[model samples]
Target: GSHMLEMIIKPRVRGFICVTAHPTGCEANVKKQIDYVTTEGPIANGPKRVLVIGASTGYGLAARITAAFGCGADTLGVFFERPGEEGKPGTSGWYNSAAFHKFAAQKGLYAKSINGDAFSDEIKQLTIDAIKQDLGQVDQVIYSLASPRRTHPKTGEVFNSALKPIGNAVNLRGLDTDKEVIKESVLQPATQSEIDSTVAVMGGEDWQMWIDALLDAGVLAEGAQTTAFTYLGEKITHDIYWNGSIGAAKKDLDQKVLAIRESLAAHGGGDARVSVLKAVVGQASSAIPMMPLYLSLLFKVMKEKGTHEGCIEQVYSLYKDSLCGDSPHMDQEGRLRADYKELDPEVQNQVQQLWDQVTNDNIYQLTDFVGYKSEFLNLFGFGIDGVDYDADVNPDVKIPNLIQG
Candidate 1:
């Protein structure tokens, strides 16, 4: 007979959406990231006044935590997520934002959040106003938004991004998490309009617009540094990732970063930068075709190499080692290679051997699918430590800051 708790919480996953979240689990997550940074010691002369564009989950949320807990920075976050509903729940990011600000308030740190469309001109103005009204100037601006679509502020045209190969059609084995089946899918080369739209949606236009708006508001602090997160996939996976529609957008972002850098330098602030980081579980990354299989293999290899890092570690490294250090190590291409450990030769060699031998029958045994699956579930307040999987909890929990406002 199966014994389970009579009145406990459980996770409900639909595609990439989790219809429920545990307030305690989300708080624990934010606190764990906070503890990670504090235990590592303070970040000397880090950005005291920080603004994170997509400051709710993944790299954005980690950056917020490091800024507040690690460096004692005053943070103003902007995100788009629905709050908790009546009986079910909202997005995990909503709870995460609530937990983050509550934690920030407890430490006497300043943390305010804006909930709206970050792609619009109105939200930009609101964020600028928040900066002016509360914090005088911002020393750092982080752009880590991952959205599938965008609406042009001036033209009022909505552009949707695509994830297809650039050149000849490429077919690859992709994982369908909903079906738990490995199927072959062909990624057709995108049309010119599709390519343009993808670049427009996912590129650096919003980032530049935000910078200009902040500059116009006269709130960018002296020697201010701004950074946007990008990705540089491995050589083999280039067909679907680095060489795909998204990669083209990143190339555009590179050009934009240079322009932002020069503009900031002229204005007395520091340089604009871009950081490349490791892959992990997220709504955006999970939707990328063939990425799950690649990440599955990588998790196994990186774990054995003892060089694996999740979002928290990667963001912490960027702050402490790159931005806060004496000499921010700039690679030849003028990018901070935060995913450097993942690109290590020995790690790749071990992965290649396993990749060659892993057949469909040995997929579970030869890969870190277990690790991957658990993290995916844990992210939505499921499969976590010390959580009652059968507990009955209210989804309409209070967000301290949101409720106060």
Candidate 2:
């Protein structure tokens, strides 16, 4: 309680970059997430040991919290986040992990975290070694990375992903979150070069490589389960998302993840698959054209239908209803459809009507712009409870796991 220091912290947003963060505020959010997991009781038959890549925020961090706290599973997390230095606050994920490390220790749970480039061979080997050295092996692996670019460790080829339509330029009506208004923007189709780059960056090559390394290292336990995260929006929004470069990348994920599933069953005595999660306001989601407007409408409909879920709830269902269940609930395509509830006929029907009806004039009445804005700010550790934004705070909090690392 005595850790509060006099440091002015405010949410400064320039485009997508949150220029500042609050350590205590960040801690508040982290504790909130940790509390949700610990207090919610155990998930039936959840994995005892879990590995979460990209375990800083969004689905990755949520899955880590669920595995560690909800299911009483020990967790090993690998992420790349900046540490605070003097006046600057650390990344939201750093504080989240730091708080989890502290909270889990109090509960006598094993929570180890590694911070580095997950796409690199070194990090993969490090993670494999950690699994062997510390927890022996993990039964579940969650891949939830959202990278815009990737550098081939060997060839040094930098692949940059894009979010443009594939066949034509689409005029997308979206919310300019920064300016707080509805705006129309045109996105041109991606060329072969861009599509290839996007595929290289977002496709399943890296995920497969990770699984291959873990399997080859003999670190996976028998019947281990692995899943990566993907987003599949409604058909109405596909022109801007599913029918584009990123969608092409997702198309690649569809086949590659299926292929990886079989390989995991053969190579590592388990299953490798992808979980199609509900779309929400996230660091990556807000950047895509047409997504914001769609999410706004979808949020309005799903919230009214009482079926809305964020990253945490969706991941929890993935564990309890799908992976952790006696028989994993998978689609005919062999993918986990964690967002099926959002696609309910009644819900989608309402969302579809609103999707066509939403306009600059009635966005406020028809959509959850208020919620969309609030969740966006919440992602960076702003607008929290029981924290004085006016108070001075110490930004140099340490992650006990990282220190031990």
Candidate 3:
């Protein structure tokens, strides 16, 4: 399905791209991607030709870098990222693609990108055509598109998700972007229809569309593996995620895995699967209402146990151990459960114990709020260790191999 919405509004800046991103900044991002892959060892039989549908940012970019640099796989990335302008700029994803394309070219790996609405049929066709032109056939497909809004292809109706409390007005603490104040907030309950529509938009429909198109174009290789990401957070986040409107969409998505498996099997390929990936702070995860507080606590506990991992770490593990493992584990419906294991009984118990006593004032003491903020900025190509944040940057760096159509 299309990616879930976790939109966090920033002050209206001059451009669509980020305000500041440097060559060194881009290099640092690339280096981290490489380091994760090198340290993770190698996939048993790594993917050689891969297509990542939402490859500009988040788990998508990480997966592309891991496959190309770590696994030595040739990759084609299809994503919808904002372009740069005169004053403000395009997103970090645009620069990220440019950097990846540059590095991939330097390494002589076949890497290219397409920027467009992944929900549209034209973009899917374009991606398949690119796959045929570049790699001939894709051995694996990774769907990682995450958007806040979508217009249904059939119904033409728009859907969006909100960050309100589930039931009655529950006073929750959240960060106020405008005032920089921590205040107790109340989120109005959602209507039944809002819940259902959020599910319809963010759930499995878009994922199924991409798979169907790839299959129809005969782009999926024999024994081709495909995976889409989903999230199931702790009990505090249960109302906002797993059991919330977004959660309902996830449930719907989980249900669609069976149909995908059947389709994959019909083509003599292994069954399609979904991975409820482990939670880490990212653009998507940080904006989910009270998630920051929850994440702060969770990260502290998980890091202390040496089990904390960011997006690259999670996706690297997903590819090496779970999806491509020697003896992979699968649920009855033929799907993997990476997030399920992360939300194990012992882990949840620890998070909940901290959750009970976590007020806005003492949250930092319990968890690493400073670390959470740093990771969030890192997503946008900011706050790296040695990079000169004071340096002026050019947002209009020419990106190579960008599919113009």
Q: In model 2, which runs have C-alpha deviations exceeding 4 angstroms?
A: 1-6, 267-269, 403-405
- Measured against the true structure, the TM-scores of the candidates, in listed sequence, are 0.94, 0.94, 0.89
Residue 170 CA displacement from its true place in model 1, Å: 0.6
Write the residue-wise lDDT of candidate 3 on 1-405 in tens digits.
Answer: 111221222323222223444444656776788777878777767789988988977788888987887778999999887666544456778878888888888888998888888878888899999988878888788888777777776677787765554566556665432333455666677787777677666788889998888888988887677888787776767756676667777787778877887777766666677777777776655465466666776788888878888778878877777767764656675567666545778878988887677665775687777787777667676766787666545555667789865
- TM-score for candidate 3, please give it: 0.89
Lowest-lDDT window of 10 residues in candidate 2?
1-10
lDDT tens per residue, model 2, 56-98: 8889999998898889999999998888877788888888888
The lDDT of each candidate is 0.81, 0.81, 0.73
Order of quality (lDDT) = 2, 1, 3
Over 229-291, each residue of candidate 1 has an lDDT whose tens digit, in order, gives: 988867657776788888889888888989889878887758888888888877544576476
Query: In model 1, how large is the Cα lDDT of residue 80?
Result: 87
Worst 10 residues of 1 by lDDT: 1-10
